[PDB]
Amino acid sequence: KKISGGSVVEMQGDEMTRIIWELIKEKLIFPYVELDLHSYDLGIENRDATNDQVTKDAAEAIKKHNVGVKCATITPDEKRVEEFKLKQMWKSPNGTIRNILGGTVFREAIICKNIPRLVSGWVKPIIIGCHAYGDQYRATDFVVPGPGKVEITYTPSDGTQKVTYLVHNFEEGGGVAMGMYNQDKSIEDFAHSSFQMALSKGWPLYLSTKNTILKKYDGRFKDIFQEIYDKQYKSQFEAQKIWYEHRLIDDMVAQAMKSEGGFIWACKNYDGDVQSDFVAQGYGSLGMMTSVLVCPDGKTVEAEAAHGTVTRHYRMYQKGQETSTNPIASIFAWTRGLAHRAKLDNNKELAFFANALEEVSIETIEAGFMTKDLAACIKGLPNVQRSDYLNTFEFMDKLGENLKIKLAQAKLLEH
Amino acid sequence: KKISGGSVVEMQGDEMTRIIWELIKEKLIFPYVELDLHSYDLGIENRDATNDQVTKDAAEAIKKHNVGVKCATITPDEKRVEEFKLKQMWKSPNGTIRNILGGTVFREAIICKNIPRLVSGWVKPIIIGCHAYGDQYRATDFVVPGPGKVEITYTPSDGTQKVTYLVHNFEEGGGVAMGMYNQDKSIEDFAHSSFQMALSKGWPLYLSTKNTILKKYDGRFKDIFQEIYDKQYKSQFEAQKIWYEHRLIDDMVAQAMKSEGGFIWACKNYDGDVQSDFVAQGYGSLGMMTSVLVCPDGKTVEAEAAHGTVTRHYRMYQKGQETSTNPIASIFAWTRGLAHRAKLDNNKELAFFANALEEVSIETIEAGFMTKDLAACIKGLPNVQRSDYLNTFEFMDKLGENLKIKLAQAK
Numbered sequence A: 001k002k003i004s005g006g007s008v009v010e011m012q013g014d015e016m017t018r019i020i021w022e023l024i025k026e027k028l029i030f031p032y033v034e035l036d037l038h039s040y041d042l043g044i045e046n047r048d049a050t051n052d053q054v055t056k057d058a059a060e061a062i063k064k065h066n067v068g069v070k071c072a073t074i075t076p077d078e079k080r081v082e083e084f085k086l087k088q089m090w091k092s093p094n095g096t097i098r099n100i101l102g103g104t105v106f107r108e109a110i111i112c113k114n115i116p117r118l119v120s121g122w123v124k125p126i127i128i129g130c131h132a133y134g135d136q137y138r139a140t141d142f143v144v145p146g147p148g149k150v151e152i153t154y155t156p157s158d159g160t161q162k163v164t165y166l167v168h169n170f171e172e173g174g175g176v177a178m179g180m181y182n183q184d185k186s187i188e189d190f191a192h193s194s195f196q197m198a199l200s201k202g203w204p205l206y207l208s209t210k211n212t213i214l215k216k217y218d219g220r221f222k223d224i225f226q227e228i229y230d231k232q233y234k235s236q237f238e239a240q241k242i243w244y245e246h247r248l249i250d251d252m253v254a255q256a257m258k259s260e261g262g263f264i265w266a267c268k269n270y271d272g273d274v275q276s277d278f279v280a281q282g283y284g285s286l287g288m289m290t291s292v293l294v295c296p297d298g299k300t301v302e303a304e305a306a307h308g309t310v311t312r313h314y315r316m317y318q319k320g321q322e323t324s325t326n327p328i329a330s331i332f333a334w335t336r337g338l339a340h341r342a343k344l345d346n347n348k349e350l351a352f353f354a355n356a357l358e359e360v361s362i363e364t365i366e367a368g369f370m371t372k373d374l375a376a377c378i379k380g381l382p383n384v385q386r387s388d389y390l391n392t393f394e395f396m397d398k399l400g401e402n403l404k405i406k407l408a409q410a411k412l413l414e415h
Numbered sequence B: 001k002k003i004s005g006g007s008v009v010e011m012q013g014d015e016m017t018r019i020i021w022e023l024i025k026e027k028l029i030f031p032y033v034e035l036d037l038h039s040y041d042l043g044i045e046n047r048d049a050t051n052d053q054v055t056k057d058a059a060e061a062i063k064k065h066n067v068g069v070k071c072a073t074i075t076p077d078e079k080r081v082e083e084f085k086l087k088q089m090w091k092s093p094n095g096t097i098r099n100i101l102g103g104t105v106f107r108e109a110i111i112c113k114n115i116p117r118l119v120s121g122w123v124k125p126i127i128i129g130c131h132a133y134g135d136q137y138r139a140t141d142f143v144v145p146g147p148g149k150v151e152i153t154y155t156p157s158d159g160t161q162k163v164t165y166l167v168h169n170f171e172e173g174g175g176v177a178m179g180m181y182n183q184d185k186s187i188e189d190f191a192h193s194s195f196q197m198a199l200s201k202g203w204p205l206y207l208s209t210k211n212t213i214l215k216k217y218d219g220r221f222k223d224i225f226q227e228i229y230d231k232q233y234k235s236q237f238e239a240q241k242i243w244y245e246h247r248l249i250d251d252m253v254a255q256a257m258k259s260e261g262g263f264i265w266a267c268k269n270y271d272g273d274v275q276s277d278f279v280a281q282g283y284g285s286l287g288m289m290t291s292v293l294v295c296p297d298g299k300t301v302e303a304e305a306a307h308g309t310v311t312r313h314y315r316m317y318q319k320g321q322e323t324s325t326n327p328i329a330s331i332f333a334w335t336r337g338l339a340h341r342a343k344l345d346n347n348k349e350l351a352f353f354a355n356a357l358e359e360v361s362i363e364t365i366e367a368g369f370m371t372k373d374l375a376a377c378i379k380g381l382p383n384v385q386r387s388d389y390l391n392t393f394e395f396m397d398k399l400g401e402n403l404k405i406k407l408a409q410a411k
Ligand SMILES: NC(=O)C1=CN([C@@H]2O[C@H](COP(=O)(O)OP(=O)(O)OC[C@H]3O[C@@H](n4cnc5c(N)ncnc54)[C@H](OP(=O)(O)O)[C@@H]3O)[C@@H](O)[C@H]2O)C=CC1
Pocket: A071, A072, A073, A074, A075, A076, A094, A286, A287, A304, A305, A306, A307, A308, A309, A310, A311, A312, A313, A324, A325, A326, A327, A329, A373, B212, B248, B251
């Protein structure tokens, strides 16, 4: 340790990303940065041991210290309950953290010049602004055991009326039902975040919904975005030769896929979750994407790997087999978190370290040292040989050596 | 015409697809086929005039005659109501028809050997099996005007205790809320048709859900699929060296995009809607995709163009400007419908015509006669010149001339 890093909230995760997370801290961060680290173990077992309280504590720590960096975590279903003998099917820690913090999760591919894409046309970045709040991640779903009536009701706080809507009358057998919601103020912040990102990047903005089907639910998003655009951003967009357009989600994915990129894509929570993997995979690999929750206040951020815990690679690791899991997304959670930390504290030295590690990461890959997923982008997966990539530790170790070099050269300047 | 086709339910549509729809009948179908056509005008105007009853009437007719062919239609929102002076924001006719018929909507790209793909790896087809029933198309959504409590309740029909769940307490301001549902029996049919499709085509089957998040709702899909697979199809899949696997939706789309294709993709209603256009565009163009609703009974079918009314092109046809709109999907609604009509009636000569017209369509494009969209797949849109494609009316004529030759040669 040497650089004064400041207060950072660290959230440890599960399976293969937990392995990578420790290597990142051991080989890339702690040798060069001293941190007032507020660590919360969001491993599935410690969440289970604290009845998921540790997750809530972590989110509140992020509000207090303004910078969070999170490792990928298991969201358990019935299979996971059996695997770890869990007490309950705990809720997604990301859902919990995102709805406590609110805001927009901006996601963007991490691009290296030597990594071919699956979508050849994407010569410019696509940035998804994913609404962090509401919808499926806060839904209330249940099994309908048999015939009966499902209704959804609204009662104003003053209790002067009650509106009851019929969802469905199950006449023969049961099934499933769910309710979900969103809030105006959150949608408004989501809109402001989306318009400001497009102006910051100088690119057009597109919002996707399905308002032809969900005329009230999605129509609200469409209406709030439009009212804010016409009233506070159309002039600035027109001044920068950019524009805002609402599109039906299904037409948006097709247009995005045949475009050349270079636009901000405001997505509802569920769509941003799914399409950000469409985008990440289209540029090359799920391992090559940044994901930063930006709250409305502007001062608090949570950086994360958007991909999962890579269970399949972890199973190989458990058997002693060689893995080649891409750590770039996990590394950029740290760099994006520390960069925001540096901005808040006017820490020029930490700002340099953060950008230097991002540069090292891209320079290492562009020099031909990469994990198997990226080697498969260059060649074809059926043509990849072992000599074409580095295993998980080898790649981390190469990054470590290149980081030591770049930081050593930085000290050889006149100071 | 002189080919006895039989009874067919027609559903006319809106805007650009309505123009193409009549050109297909006047030039590709009627000249050669005589059939008892039960026409229902699902144009936005007639739907408004009949308070959408024509849509429901058309759905019931399909259940009676077993084969329907549907043109793309407008699903009106606010801006559409102002456009046509509508009485109400009529529900999507597709949602209406699909929930009345139920079943699974199987969507597959229409492949031509000379049209490059956006996803280079997709050398084998991807067949999406989209659950036709429930979910967003039957949801109940509303605006929450201010602070208050939204709750969802289940009152069992057996008199036992009512179950109430809190959806959200709005404390500061309002927002939106919605309820949706699905039925076990429909999910069971959706699963059976997915496993049967995979076995008939000889490809593995994937089901996508977000059951880690919707643990009960999506878990029900996952459990029902797995139950039926283990009890009724696992041995058959192993016999054909294929497999069934559940994947989280975001993993699925990423796995699909880097795959070589060649699998059946079972989607919930919403995912199938979005990802079918992902698949269609990835193979080349939204105009090159078939969409057929297969009812559970297996003997009833509704064929359609998966894509919409191509509104942007219609604003050019209204301004007298040349357009190049791909009619192949609309044509294949007829051929897939007439084909199933022939399978039911054991009509060997109608089946030949249906298959002949599909071949003519693909042979014409593979000979270099195509609409602008397919020219863009080859040369890239920034490099497309007028000589590289045929406008909508020129392309329909080239197809009809190739059909007259394909058939007459058959004699
Ligand atoms: N906290 C979070 O942000 C998220 C957590 N999860 C959780 O992760 C667990 C596993 O989810 P799963 O659906 O398997 O999704 P993952 O994203 O963990 O993995 C799916 C596949 O994507 C590829 N992949 C993803 N990340 C990388 C990487 N860094 N390097 C190389 N390949 C990568 C691998 O493909 P291949 O097998 O072809 O090598 C992997 O098998 C679940 O418990 C889920 O709840 C899931 C998503 C997000």
